[PDB]
Symmetry: C2
Subunit: 136 residues, 2 copies
């Protein structure tokens, strides 16, 4: 499975369907998150599965339960003013890293939607980040 090629194809499908990617992605929550390299300044787009809790948008640095954070997490910490595409809209956001009880409560809500997040946190002692993409 070529994930790098399938990234650009997913971005295309998302944009052409108004954020309603089809096929095997049909029912998944999905956002396109732009992120700028902490060192390079190079911009990339990450299709990510968010928690859409009411009108708020959260993303999770699970990386499959790896012992490292995903690059997009470090990029949003360094450059939190970015853009997200959700549905038919694109809007400026400020990334906010959750901590403490708020982070635990949001993580638990995601475990309730997608139980693999329980496994991911069991697999590493790294605290998996929760990032709110706050609409500006």
């Amino acid at each position: 499975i070529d994930w790098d090629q399938m990234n650009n194809q997913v971005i295309k499908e998302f944009r052409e369907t108004g954020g309603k990617a089809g096929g095997l992605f049909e029912g998944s929550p999905l956002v396109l998150v732009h992120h700028t390299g902490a060192k390079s300044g190079k911009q990339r787009i990450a299709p990510l599965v968010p928690l859409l809790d009411g009108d708020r948008i959260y993303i999770f640095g699970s990386k499959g339960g790896a012992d490292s954070h995903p690059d997009w997490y470090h990029n949003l910490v360094a450059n939190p003013d970015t853009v997200v595409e959700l549905g038919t809209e694109t809007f400026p956001v400020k990334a906010r890293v959750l901590t403490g009880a708020e982070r635990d409560e949001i993580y638990a809500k995601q475990v309730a939607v997608a139980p693999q997040f329980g496994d991911y946190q069991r697999k590493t002692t790294r605290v998996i980040p929760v990032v709110e993409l706050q609409r500006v």
Copy 2:
């Protein structure tokens, strides 16, 4: 995007990761649902995004808001005794088609997780099916 080839690749990845497909699928709820052709008796596997509400499992015949139901829906109506793969487990299930208020309540829970389901139901006057996969 070759969905037919990417079906077998997703099935492989699901089985090898214990139901924790990675890459662009990392955070999505996902089950593999076996279904037998209503006329042919031919067996197929559909990777589908369920609602995992407590310990119950529901799937949605949205078909992108099309005016027809997906083939797997007709197949489960004809042959409701089947198998689902969830996480690291595989278990026999009986498919039950929801109706009335119960169907509306479960559909609303899925719209709250994945808002595109609101769009899909707006797009067709066909009532989108909700099917519980009941563990035997």
